[PDB]
C-alpha cells in the first residue's frame, strides 16, 4: 500500500488566554489509502516550544495564549503519515483584510452554489462555513475547503429545504485569514409554516391600528416578500391589502363606528403564502 495521498482539510474556531477548537475532515478511502489509525497535531506558540497531541477524532480543543501559533496536522495509516496541513493562528492583535467581492449564493440542481470575484492577490485556500439561522438554535457551522484557484463552488454535504443558511466565505493567505464575507440563502424555499398573528394596537371609531410580530426565521421557510391583510364585516365584503415585508403596523381607514370587523393576515414567500389566526374587534 502507501501512506495517505493528501493532507486533511484543516481549520479552526476561536473565542474567549483564548480557547481554540481545531477541526478537520475525514479523508476519503481513496486518499487515506487504508484504515485511519489517528491524527497528529502540533502547536508552536510563537518563539516558544512545540506542543503535540495525537487523537483518533476530528476535533481538538485547547487553551492558547493571545500570541501567534503555527498548527500542523497529519493523518496516519499503517504505511505512514500524510503530509502536514498547516494553519496560522494569528496573534490576538491581528487585522484581517482583503475580503471576497460580489459574494452570492443560489440553488441549482438541488445544490446550493456559492460564487465570488477572484481577488487580485494570490490566495492559498478558501474556507466556506454555513449554519441554519434559527431562534431556537445557535449558529453551529458545517464547513469545507477549496483551493486558492476556486471562485465558484457548491456547499458539500446534506442541506435542508425550507431552511435559511448563513454562508461565510473566508480567504486564506500565508499570513492569516482575510476578512470574512457572509450571505443568507435557501436551498429550496416554501410557503411559511405559520401566518402572522394580527392584533389591535389602538382601536378607534372610524379607523383601526393593527400590529403584528415578524415571523421567527425558522417558520418563514424562505425570504418573506410581503404580508396581506384581509378584513370584512359579518355582512360585508372582504378587502385585501398589500403590506411591505418590513412593516409591523398598518392603519385601516374608512371604518364604520360601532361595528364588528374580522381580520386575518398572510405571509408570502417566493413559493406561496400562509394565513394566520382569525381576529375580531369592534369600533
User: Applying CB under 5 A, does 189 fall inside the site for Cl ion?
Assistant: no
Q: How far is the CB of 207 from Cl ion (least distance, A)?
A: 59
- Residues 35, 13: Cα–Cα separation, whole Å: 28
User: Applying CB under 5 A, does 153 fall inside the site for Cl ion?
Assistant: no
Q: Which of these segments, 119-127, 144-152, 228-236, 274-282, binds Cl ion (CB under 5 A)?
A: 144-152
Output b/e per residue, 156-185; b: 16+ Cβ within 10 A: eeebeebbbbbbbbbbbbeebbbeebeeeb
Plot region of 102 (φ>0 → left; ψ -120 to 50 → alpha; else → beta): left
User: Applying CB under 5 A, does 145 fall inside the site for Cl ion?
Assistant: yes
Q: How far is the CB of 27 from Cl ion (least distance, A)?
A: 10
User: Applying CB under 5 A, does 144 fall inside the site for Cl ion?
Assistant: yes
DSSP class of residue 31?
H
Between the alpha carbon of residue 95 and those of residues 68, 177, 180, the distances in Å are 13, 9, 12
Q: Which of these segments, 34-42, 124-132, 142-150, 235-243, binds Cl ion (CB under 5 A)?
A: 142-150
- Subset of 14-43 contacting Cl ion (CB under 5 A): 25
Q: How far is the CB of 123 from Cl ion (least distance, A)?
A: 16
User: Applying CB under 5 A, does 9 fall inside the site for Cl ion?
Assistant: yes
Does residue 270 contact residue 225 with C-beta atoms inside 8 Å?
A: yes
User: Applying CB under 5 A, does 134 fall inside the site for Cl ion?
Assistant: no
Question: Is residue 56 classed as helix, strand or coil in its secondary structure?
Answer: coil
Which CB atom, from 167 or from 267, has the smaller least distance to Cl ion? 167
Residues interacting with Cl ion, by CB under 5 A?
A: 9, 25, 144-145
Amino acid at each position: 500500500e502507501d501512506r495517505p495521498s493528501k493532507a486533511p482539510s484543516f481549520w479552526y474556531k476561536i473565542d474567549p488566554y483564548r480557547t481554540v477548537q481545531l477541526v478537520w475532515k475525514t479523508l476519503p478511502p481513496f486518499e487515506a489509502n487504508g484504515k485511519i489509525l489517528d491524527y497528529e497535531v502540533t502547536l508552536t506558540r510563537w518563539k516558544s516550544h512545540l506542543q503535540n497531541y495525537t487523537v483518533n477524532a476530528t476535533k481538538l480543543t485547547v487553551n492558547l495564549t493571545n500570541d501567534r501559533y503555527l498548527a500542523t496536522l497529519t493523518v496516519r495509516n499503517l504505511v505512514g503519515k500524510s503530509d502536514a496541513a498547516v494553519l496560522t493562528i494569528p496573534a490576538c492583535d491581528f487585522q484581517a483584510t482583503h475580503p471576497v467581492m460580489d459574494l452570492k449564493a443560489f440553488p441549482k440542481d438541488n445544490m446550493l452554489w456559492v460564487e465570488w470575484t477572484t481577488p487580485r492577490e494570490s490566495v492559498k485556500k478558501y474556507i466556506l462555513e454555513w449554519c441554519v439561522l434559527s431562534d431556537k438554535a445557535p449558529c453551529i457551522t458545517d464547513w469545507q475547503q477549496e483551493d486558492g484557484t476556486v471562485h465558484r463552488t457548491y456547499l458539500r454535504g446534506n442541506l435542508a429545504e425550507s431552511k435559511c443558511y448563513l454562508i461565510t466565505v473566508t480567504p486564506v493567505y500565508a499570513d492569516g485569514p482575510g476578512s470574512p464575507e457572509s450571505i443568507k440563502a435557501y436551498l429550496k424555499q416554501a410557503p411559511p409554516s405559520k401566518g402572522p398573528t394580527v392584533r389591535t394596537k389602538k382601536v378607534g371609531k372610524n379607523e383601526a391600528v393593527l400590529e403584528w410580530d415578524q415571523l421567527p426565521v425558522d417558520v418563514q421557510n424562505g425570504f418573506i416578500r410581503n404580508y396581506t391583510i384581509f378584513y370584512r364585516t359579518i355582512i360585508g365584503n372582504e378587502t385585501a391589502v398589500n403590506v411591505d415585508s418590513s412593516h409591523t403596523e398598518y392603519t385601516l381607514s374608512s371604518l364604520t363606528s360601532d361595528t364588528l370587523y374580522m381580520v386575518r393576515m398572510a405571509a408570502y414567500t417566493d413559493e406561496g403564502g400562509k394565513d394566520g389566526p382569525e381576529f375580531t374587534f369592534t369600533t
